[PDB]
Structure 1
């Protein structure tokens, strides 16, 4: 029952963000409860233990000066080390909103695979494949289930892109069918989704 010091901090921390973003952080970083220099700021700011989505978002998806460092710091806090490339490109652009559309995701992707490689390390050749491939899928899903991009690509086409972008990786065909399956079978993606608006 005796409320531990740490617990008391975690609570007050969430409150800050609720009133204003970057407040809960400065607290832990000011009280030594956290490690500044974009070290721990990643494991926390990136998500935290109940941080306001609107807050973390405003900090992730704009520009700033220090923020850019927080993102580059650690690129593996999207809970998908054992999930898969595609599956990651499905649900990983919410809780913040990416205003502008296809334009910033490019850079964010280069660094995405550049650090996320840890998830596999050797599976996607090195890193280039992980990046170039990632986008290939982001487009697939989009064109797949989109009103402004009514196309509905096929698994074959993907393989057509993989068999060349890999630069030698090749990647099992069966894997391409499963990785792409996560999409066709589990549509939806970047913000501004239908999310079943018909609900009257």
Structure 2
């Protein structure tokens, strides 16, 4: 118990070291599923350390990433709602390539939970980035040219198997972002 509190503190400073500690002292089973659950529950865990671990390119951290995304439940959630839940569970790492890998795992899982919303996982992936960019455009003061809902609709044309997504869907997502910037954790 104070060994687990020691491991949690060690993980928060260095995720690789903390997991190495928890495994070595038989406090955490060494599987991607058990590690993904420990991260998903995140009890006494820092969300930047969670994100840093999930963002590593090592084949095993990638396995943990996919197992972590599998624990997320996105059924009957619109894309923004699902993004909010996902983006709250860990802090996105800084690197563009790490964010892309994490967003690919998110898009696949969103579509698995909501088949029929998007013709392909790639449409979901592309729209998820357009939503992230929209969140910055609307809420970051350095962006002076704020996109209107019509501009957001026009910018996303042709993404759904060559076609356009329903405007009701796009307007709803835009409205959600406009009314509430993504909560970004530390």
Superposition TM-score tier, normalisation by shorter sequence: 0.7 to 0.9
Stretch deviating more after TM superposition (151-160 or 53-62): 53-62
- What is the CA deviation profile of residues 147-190 of structure 1, one whole-angstrom value per residue up to 9, with x for unaligned ones? 33332111112222333101267443222221111100112455
SS of the residue 1:156 aligns to: helix
Where structure 2 has 5 or more consecutive residues not aligned to the other structure, the ranges are none
SS of the residue 2:75 aligns to: coil
Check 1:37–1:128 CA distance in 2 against 1; reply closer, same or farther (3 A cut).
Answer: same
**Is the CA contact 1:57–1:96 (under 8 Å) kept in the aligned structure 2?**
yes
Cα offset, 1:77, TM superposition: 4.2
Cα offset, 1:113, TM superposition: 0.6
Where structure 1 has 5 or more consecutive residues not aligned to the other structure, the ranges are 1-6, 192-199
TM-score, normalization: structure 2?
0.72
SS of the residue 1:164 aligns to: coil
CA distance in 1, matches of 2:163, 2:4: 45
Residue 92 (structure 2) pairs with residue 114 (structure 1):
no
**Is the CA contact 1:76–1:116 (under 8 Å) kept in the aligned structure 2?**
no
Check 1:32–1:101 CA distance in 2 against 1; reply closer, same or farther (3 A cut).
Answer: closer
**Is the CA contact 1:93–1:190 (under 8 Å) kept in the aligned structure 2?**
yes
How many correspondences in the alignment? 186
Q: Which has the higher helix share?
A: 2
Check 1:47–1:16 CA distance in 2 against 1; reply closer, same or farther (3 A cut).
Answer: same
Cα offset, 1:84, TM superposition: 2.3
Check 1:46–1:90 CA distance in 2 against 1; reply closer, same or farther (3 A cut).
Answer: closer
TM-score, normalization: structure 1?
0.68
Q: What RMSD over aligned residues (CA atoms) do the two structures have, in Å?
A: 3.9
Aligned to 1:23: 17
Check 1:96–1:117 CA distance in 2 against 1; reply closer, same or farther (3 A cut).
Answer: closer
CA distance in 1, matches of 2:120, 2:163: 9
CA distance in 2, matches of 1:81, 1:135: 20
Aligned to 1:52: 46
**Is the CA contact 2:55–2:102 (under 8 Å) kept in the aligned structure 1?**
no
Tell which structure's C-alpha radius of gyration is larger: 1
